[PDB]
Design an enzyme around this catalytic site. Structure first.
Site, short mmCIF file in Angstrom:
data_model
loop_
_atom_site.label_atom_id
_atom_site.label_comp_id
_atom_site.label_asym_id
_atom_site.label_seq_id
_atom_site.Cartn_x
_atom_site.Cartn_y
_atom_site.Cartn_z
N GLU A 220 21.32 -30.32 -1.79
CA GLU A 220 22.48 -29.47 -2.04
C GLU A 220 22.34 -28.13 -1.34
OE1 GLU A 220 24.53 -31.34 -3.53
OE2 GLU A 220 23.08 -32.78 -4.34
N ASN B 95 7.55 -7.24 2.13
CA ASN B 95 6.53 -6.55 1.35
C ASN B 95 7.06 -5.28 0.71
OD1 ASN B 95 4.60 -8.52 2.32
ND2 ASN B 95 4.55 -7.35 4.23
N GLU C 92 -10.50 -19.76 7.93
CA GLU C 92 -11.62 -19.08 7.32
C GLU C 92 -12.15 -19.88 6.13
OE1 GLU C 92 -9.56 -15.56 6.47
OE2 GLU C 92 -8.34 -16.48 4.90
N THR D 243 -3.63 -17.38 11.24
CA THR D 243 -3.80 -18.71 10.67
C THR D 243 -2.48 -19.27 10.16
OG1 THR D 243 -6.09 -18.22 10.07
CG2 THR D 243 -5.02 -20.06 8.94
N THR E 191 0.91 -3.84 7.85
CA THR E 191 -0.43 -4.27 7.49
C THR E 191 -1.33 -4.35 8.72
OG1 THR E 191 0.23 -6.59 7.64
CG2 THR E 191 0.45 -5.51 5.50
N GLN F 86 -3.76 -17.00 4.75
CA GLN F 86 -4.05 -16.09 3.64
C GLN F 86 -2.87 -15.98 2.68
OE1 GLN F 86 -7.00 -14.48 3.21
NE2 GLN F 86 -6.19 -13.84 1.22
N1 GTP Z 1 3.58 -9.93 0.12
C1 GTP Z 1 2.41 -10.52 0.35
N2 GTP Z 1 1.92 -10.63 1.63
C2 GTP Z 1 0.74 -11.23 1.87
C3 GTP Z 1 -0.01 -11.74 0.83
N3 GTP Z 1 -1.13 -12.28 1.34
C4 GTP Z 1 -1.12 -12.11 2.68
N4 GTP Z 1 0.03 -11.45 3.02
C5 GTP Z 1 0.45 -11.10 4.39
O1 GTP Z 1 -0.58 -11.41 5.32
C6 GTP Z 1 -0.56 -10.48 6.37
C7 GTP Z 1 -1.98 -10.29 6.90
O2 GTP Z 1 -2.26 -11.25 7.89
P1 GTP Z 1 -2.53 -12.77 7.46
O3 GTP Z 1 -1.27 -13.50 7.07
O4 GTP Z 1 -3.51 -12.75 6.31
O5 GTP Z 1 -3.22 -13.47 8.72
P2 GTP Z 1 -3.68 -15.01 8.60
O6 GTP Z 1 -2.47 -15.90 8.46
O7 GTP Z 1 -4.61 -15.17 7.43
O8 GTP Z 1 -4.46 -15.29 9.97
P3 GTP Z 1 -5.66 -14.31 10.37
O9 GTP Z 1 -5.11 -12.99 10.86
O10 GTP Z 1 -6.49 -14.94 11.46
O11 GTP Z 1 -6.50 -14.08 9.14
C8 GTP Z 1 0.00 -9.20 5.79
O12 GTP Z 1 0.91 -8.62 6.69
C9 GTP Z 1 0.72 -9.62 4.53
O13 GTP Z 1 2.10 -9.39 4.67
C10 GTP Z 1 0.47 -11.64 -0.47
O14 GTP Z 1 -0.18 -12.09 -1.40
N5 GTP Z 1 1.68 -11.03 -0.71
MG MG Z 2 -5.94 -15.97 8.79
#
Ligand code: GTP
Ligand code: MG
Ligand code: GDP
Ligand code: GDP
Lengths: 52, 436, 50, 49, 50, 426, 426
Positions: free
Chosen positions: B253, B205, B70, B144, B178, B10
């Site tokens: 570098e 974040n 997904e 993921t 989160t 994501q």
């Molecule tokens: N700062 C920031 N964090 C993001 C962003 N998109 C996703 N995240 C991070 O993603 C976390 C949510 O879990 P995911 O990384 O989406 O989990 P995943 O890798 O998709 O794997 P799954 O849980 O199975 O969906 C949050 O804690 C966010 O910190 C973004 O656009 N900006």
């Molecule tokens: Mg995921």
């Protein structure tokens, strides 16, 4: 080369300590002398208004 | 001279939505993969070849790979504005998400799509001639991006090895949580990445919410806001390879000038100047101002106090109007500054670099177009506090054997739990030792 | 805060000492040049008188 | 919390300025050594004159 | 051959540095003790006058 | 008929040489196209020292161009006075040393030395009577100080009688632009001291302070630093290119400036340096030129030359002048600064005169002083080396591509002994 | 041969010197562009006393500006004839003098006077056979007295064989500019009477009375006052630039005037000073130029000589005249006013004649007297000093910068004994 460096470092340190201690002593002595010369200048200026 | 980016999960694909927007916008590529004939911005035809290769007759396709389990976000970006931009096979996705579990995303489901992803990346790399290295953007706190993310790190390392690895992970922040089970998939991936990937530049974040609150005044910001400046820092660290300047620094570098010890490689990133249009001209930008803003703690991508640490090395990219004298004067002032300390065995620690091209503003954003912009990536020992807090919260749940049944049912056991715990403890010990 | 102020005061004291020493070095360098010029002049005078 | 954070900043400031003072002491000593070297040279040239 | 001649040069340099450093330290101490003797003579004269 | 072969390595060396082949080409009066458009004849008489006339009237410089990225080849080729370098000389890698001495001296430098040696050998054999090799190369990189040193050793092996002029811009302590610059400087100076005929050390803090004080340039850039260095480098050879009253070649300079084998680390300066605002207030007279030359802040090395004692010095004046006041001034300087001169050598200064002053100016001078105050530049780099090696910092990068502790320990030892042998005469 | 270096300390000194240089450039016939556009060769025979040939006629004055602000420097550059000085001599700090003796003699002096000595020494060594120094300043300010007086002391210690002319605008009670004028005047004369060799004392009170009575001006701004002080400082030394029937060097003037090494304060005037209206009626021959010369209301000092006695006088005439006429003039003046003269000095008047009159005028004269009535200014300034020193008013601004009460008492005692030395002879 180790002997070289050790000897040269020893000479440098002794020169350092001599210079520092000597400078401190001279500063103290010069302060004393400045006080003394201020005293003499005040005496010289004061004795102008003294009558004979 | 090309660098291949992999986006996982994501966060990876959202940061990709921001970056592969910024790069095309800067190189003037239309969102259909073409460049207008009538109007041509000033640049070299080799400049865009670092990212967007040519396919036949006036067609540009990016060098990248989005991948996820997904189908939701991937077909969302498919439906989005950039339809013909990405090659239909630069978007790899499963059909069932890992659902926030390192084990589930690394063993059960992670062992089907990685072969196709690796085959695609291998063919794309063989297409590429001067591959500088591999850049990864992901979240360590998810399923993921963490499980098959580490799987792909391992497989890329065993496939190429000799090419540099630069990661950009999104750790959990101190207070804003989160998800709930996040520390598990954080520490489990830390155990691997601490010795697989070469250089890791960390993100957070709250560390960006605070910045966009103070310097941007967006009191209710979101990921769509943060990802834009994330893309900005990535571009400002690859700008030397991309464009031409006065004092270039390629992808080697950074590793040669910022990684003293093989197991001491973790970077704090910072970007200046973060300013909106309202204050852009009401304030007087200059090299001293932007450098001091960069080296104050409150303008950092990672929530940490460098004043509890001792900087080991720093790299300063500069863009736009930059004379190589004002930068020297400002960094001399920084070295003279009475707050940031240095480890006693690093006399010279400021790898600078300059590029002529000034930063490019995305329309509808909050950042204003400015004459110049810096980017500071530092290897510092203050990052150990992050892992110390991570362990201090990890043991609290590990002791109770809570939330572990999911992983044990998937197949992993607590042996590797203890292994990750002990190895991150050793990493904290190592930072303590290097702090001498 | 008392400790920090005291350390600052020592810092300015040392800086003043440095500047004074540099001034003394400049004066002594000027005297070096003048003395060497006098050396040369008196050497020429010695040869002429002989 | 505010007081202790300020205290940590003060301690960092104090140790760094102590380091700076030590560096200044070293510089002053080196200057003094150069000084009496120069004085030696001056006295030798004066003797020759 | 390089390291043999380097050894010989090192020995000669060792002797030279020994002599130079000892002579310099002795001379500088003599000069500055003469200076402080002059200063204390001045102090004694001032005390007597006072 | 006495040929100079110019070798340029890396970004820094390439830019410096770009300014060099700007200045000297203008002096011999060729257009940027490559066709002679001078007016006099004395400037045509010695085109051979820095040019190889080719059919069609396009002169081409005798300068080898070596680096490991086309990002420097194109930066030095597209710039002004760039379309006259011969394309065949454009030998280049496309990997990039990356501030590492190992990667540019043992693997990629190792595989590129074959081609660069082929180019330099055909260049040497295409000219009748060599006079010398002069290399303008940085010391803080890995494509100028890693491969440049290997090329220097190779040239010494293939021609063990030709003078070598190493224009080496050593790094700066306060001006930090890399983190392993002490490594890439010490390891190259170690192998340069043994195989260099004369080493002109340079720096950028000195060039900045000069462009602040004398030229009063508000915003001095590399386009000015390299311009000044080009002026000095084109002035170093006036006799081999123009007539005069008392000529001086590289061999003459070496004989009059090198009293001991290892002791050939000179320090360099140029006159007259003056601001454009004050170009018409001061007088270009020999006393003024010499007074400017014999200062301490007029030099191009961070070492304050007023610490030690000049073992020897050389001045190259250029212009219709009077050798009587030339010698009178450069002897009065010894009589008035005999303290800063070593005693067991009479006439520490060698002065030479060329007839034709450079373009634009009217009476120029170059200073090359072999002094023992140059020790303080190497002592600081040795200190940095010891500080970094005391903790084995960044050592994995070096030892992962063939390097061993042998090179590092030898470099420490020889830096220490070199600073000792300079300190001996004091 | 003989030459004089010039220094302009503070704002008052800077403006007076600027007008002086305009006057000298007019007399020697040069343009503000620096080129020579005069008429005769007698002026360019001896311009090397004040000017240097830079490059093809661009004559540069031998003076150095000196203050602690850039505003006055910018004003003098922007003014006419301000485009001739060497930009290397515009030495000036930035902080601000604060009209404070400590701030101009103990902190900014210690932070800029090494540089001012460096530039003045460069000029004094460029010139070959020195003759003296010339300095312009005011004794009522901080950097007028502090900076200038410390410079005087250092230069006296460094070249203690050169006659020194310091022109001092002493404060006058009615024109009271600031509050610490007596303090500054005391602390400045304390050093002048001990180091500098002669000060010509001037004052705004008489500089205004002259303009109101003799010149009959309506609104005299500082331009006219500086014009008069210029026309005096231009004729103080003319036997150098131009030939004369009876020459008089500066040292000759000093030895004839100063009888004892501590009575060297000169009160000076100029003739003729004719109003624009009555000039067309006035008659200009020697036995009225001398009458106006000894007219007590022409003196640029608020100390009427009828309140004291003359120790020595000097009359420098300019133009083709009759020497016997001049001598009989002086003799009959002495016999007429025998009372105003000292008994034990026969022929108290020294007369000199130069062969070139100033621009336009056909005859001119300058008077420099050493009368013992000049004690009035020192007595008045000492009274104003002791009016404040009883209560330590405005004294912490010097105490905090590091001067005790001992030096204040020293300076006041110095003034008192100087007044005693004048009064005793009378
Ligand atoms: N700062 C920031 N964090 C993001 C962003 N998109 C996703 N995240 C991070 O993603 C976390 C949510 O879990 P995911 O990384 O989406 O989990 P995943 O890798 O998709 O794997 P799954 O849980 O199975 O969906 C949050 O804690 C966010 O910190 C973004 O656009 N900006
Ligand atoms: Mg995921
Ligand atoms: N004077 C001068 N210095 C330069 C120039 N270009 C680079 N440098 C300096 O030279 C040092 C070493 O450069 P280097 O790493 O060898 O560049 P490279 O050839 O790409 O490896 C750097 O710290 C630069 O500051 C130039 O054109 N002129
Ligand atoms: N003759 C003359 N006197 C001036 C002029 N301008 C200022 N002054 C006098 O100079 C005095 C100011 O002293 P100042 O130079 O500021 O003291 P400083 O700051 O220590 O140099 C005033 O009392 C004025 O009377 C001028 O143009 N001509």
């Amino acid at each position: 080369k180790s002997s070289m460096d050790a000897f040269r470092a020893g000479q440098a340190e002794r020169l350092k300590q001599l210079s520092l201690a000597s400078s401190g002593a001279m500063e103290t002595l010069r302060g004393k002398l400045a006080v003394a010369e201020n005293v003499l200048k005040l005496a010289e200026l004061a004795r102008k208004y003294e009558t004979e | 001279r090309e660098v291949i980016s992999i986006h996982i999960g994501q966060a990876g694909i959202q940061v990709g939505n921001a970056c592969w927007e910024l790069y095309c916008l800067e190189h003037g590529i239309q969102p259909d993969g073409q460049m207008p004939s009538d109007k041509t911005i000033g640049g070299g035809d080799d400049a865009f070849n670092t990212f967007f290769s040519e396919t036949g007759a006036g067609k540009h396709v990016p060098r990248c790979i989005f991948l996820d389990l997904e189908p939701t976000v991937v077909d969302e970006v498919r439906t989005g504005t950039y339809r013909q931009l990405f090659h239909p096979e630069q978007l790899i996705s499963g059909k069932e998400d890992a659902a926030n579990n390192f084990a589930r995303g690394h063993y059960t489901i992670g062992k089907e799509i990685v072969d196709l992803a690796l085959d695609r990346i291998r063919k794309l790399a063989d297409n590429c001639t001067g591959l500088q290295g591999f850049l990864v953007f992901n979240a360590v706190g998810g399923g993921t991006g963490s499980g098959l993310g580490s799987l792909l790190l391992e497989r890329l390392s065993v496939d190429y090895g000799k090419k540099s690895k630069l990661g950009f992970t999104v750790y959990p922040s101190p207070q804003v949580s989160t998800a709930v089970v996040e520390p598990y998939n954080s520490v489990l991936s830390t155990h691997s990445l601490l010795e697989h990937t070469d250089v890791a530049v960390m993100l957070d974040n709250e560390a960006i919410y605070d910045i966009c609150r103070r310097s941007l005044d967006i009191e209710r910001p979101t990921y769509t806001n943060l990802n834009r400046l994330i893309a900005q820092v990535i571009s400002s660290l690859t700008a030397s390879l991309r464009f031409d300047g006065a004092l270039n620094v390629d992808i080697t570098e950074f590793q040669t000038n910022l990684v003293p010890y093989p197991r001491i490689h973790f970077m704090l990133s910072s970007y200046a100047p973060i300013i909106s249009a309202e204050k852009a001209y009401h304030e007087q930008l200059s090299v001293a101002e932007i450098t001091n803003a960069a080296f104050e703690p409150a303008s950092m991508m990672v929530k940490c106090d460098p004043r509890h640490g001792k900087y080991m090395a720093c790299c300063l990219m500069y863009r736009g109007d930059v004379v190589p004298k004002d930068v020297n004067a400002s960094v001399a002032t920084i070295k003279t500054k009475r707050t940031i300390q240095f480890v006693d065995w690093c006399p010279t620690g400021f790898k600078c670099g300059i590029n002529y091209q000034p930063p490019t503003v995305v329309p509808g954003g909050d950042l204003a177009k400015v004459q110049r912009a810096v980017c500071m990536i530092s290897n510092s020992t203050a990052i150990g506090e992050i892992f110390s807090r991570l362990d201090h919260k990890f043991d609290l749940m590990y002791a109770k054997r809570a939330f572990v049944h999911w992983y044990v049912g998937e197949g992993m056991e607590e042996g590797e739990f203890s292994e990750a715990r002990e190895d991150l403890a050793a990493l904290e010990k190592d930072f303590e030792e290097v702090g001498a | 805060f008392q400790k920090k102020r005291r350390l600052e005061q020592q810092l300015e004291g040392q800086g003043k000492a440095i500047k004074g020493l540099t001034s003394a070095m400049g004066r002594l360098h000027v005297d070096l040049t003048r003395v060497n010029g006098l050396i040369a002049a008196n050497s020429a005078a010695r040869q002429a008188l002989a | 919390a505010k007081l202790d954070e300020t205290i940590s900043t003060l301690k960092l400031e104090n140790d760094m300025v102590s380091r700076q003072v030590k560096g200044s002491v070293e510089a002053r000593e080196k200057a003094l050594v150069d000084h009496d070297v120069l004085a030696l040279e001056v006295k030798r040239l004066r003797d020759i004159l | 051959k390089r390291i043999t001649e380097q050894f010989k040069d090192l020995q000669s340099k060792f002797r030279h540095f020994e002599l130079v450093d000892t002579k310099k330290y002795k001379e500088v101490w003599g000069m500055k003790e003469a200076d402080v003797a002059a200063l204390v003579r001045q102090l004694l004269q001032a005390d007597k006058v006072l | 008929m006495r040929e100079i072969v110019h070798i340029q390595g890396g970004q820094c060396g390439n830019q410096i040489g770009a300014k060099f082949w700007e200045v000297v080409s203008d002096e011999h009066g060729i257009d940027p196209t490559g066709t002679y458009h001078g007016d006099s004849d004395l400037q045509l008489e010695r085109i051979n020292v820095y040019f190889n006339e080719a059919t069609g009237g396009r002169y081409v410089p005798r300068a080898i161009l070596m680096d490991l990225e086309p990002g420097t080849m194109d930066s030095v080729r597209s710039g002004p006075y760039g379309q006259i370098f011969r394309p065949d000389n454009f030998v280049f890698g496309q990997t990039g040393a990356g501030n590492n001495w190992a990667k540019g001296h043992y693997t990629e430098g190792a595989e590129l030395i074959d081609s660069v040696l082929d180019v330099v050998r055909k260049e040497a054999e295409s000219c009748d009577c060599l006079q010398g090799f002069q290399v303008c190369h940085s010391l803080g990189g890995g494509t100028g100080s890693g491969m440049g040193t290997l090329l220097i050793s190779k040239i010494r092996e293939e021609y063990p009688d030709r003078m070598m002029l190493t224009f080496s811009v050593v790094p700066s302590p306060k001006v930090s632009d890399t983190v392993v610059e002490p490594y890439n400087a010490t390891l190259s100076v170690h192998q340069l001291v043994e195989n260099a005929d004369e080493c002109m050390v340079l720096d950028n803090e000195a060039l900045y302070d000069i462009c602040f004080r004398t030229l009063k340039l508000t915003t001095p850039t590399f386009g000015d630093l390299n311009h000044l260095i080009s002026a000095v480098m084109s002035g170093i050879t006036c006799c081999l290119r123009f007539p005069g009253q008392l000529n001086a070649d590289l061999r003459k300079l070496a004989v009059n400036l090198i009293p001991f084998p290892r002791l050939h680390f000179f320090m360099v300066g140029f006159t007259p340096l003056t601001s454009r605002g004050s170009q018409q207030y001061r007088a270009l007279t020999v006393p003024e030129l010499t007074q400017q030359m014999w200062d301490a802040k007029n030099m191009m090395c961070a070492a304050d030359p007023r610490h030690g004692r000049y073992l020897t010095a050389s001045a190259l004046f250029r212009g219709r002048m009077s050798t009587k006041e030339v010698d009178e001034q450069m002897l009065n300087v010894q009589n008035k600064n005999s303290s800063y001169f070593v005693e067991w050598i009479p006439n520490n200064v060698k002065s030479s005169v060329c007839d034709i002053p450079p373009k634009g100016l009217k009476m120029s001078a170059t200073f090359i002083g072999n002094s023992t105050a140059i020790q303080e530049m190497f002592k600081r780099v040795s200190e940095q080396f010891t500080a970094m090696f005391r903790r084995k910092a960044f050592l994995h990068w070096y030892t992962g591509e063939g390097m061993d502790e042998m090179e590092f320990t030898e470099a420490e030892s020889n830096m220490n002994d070199l600073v000792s042998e300079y300190q001996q005469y004091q």
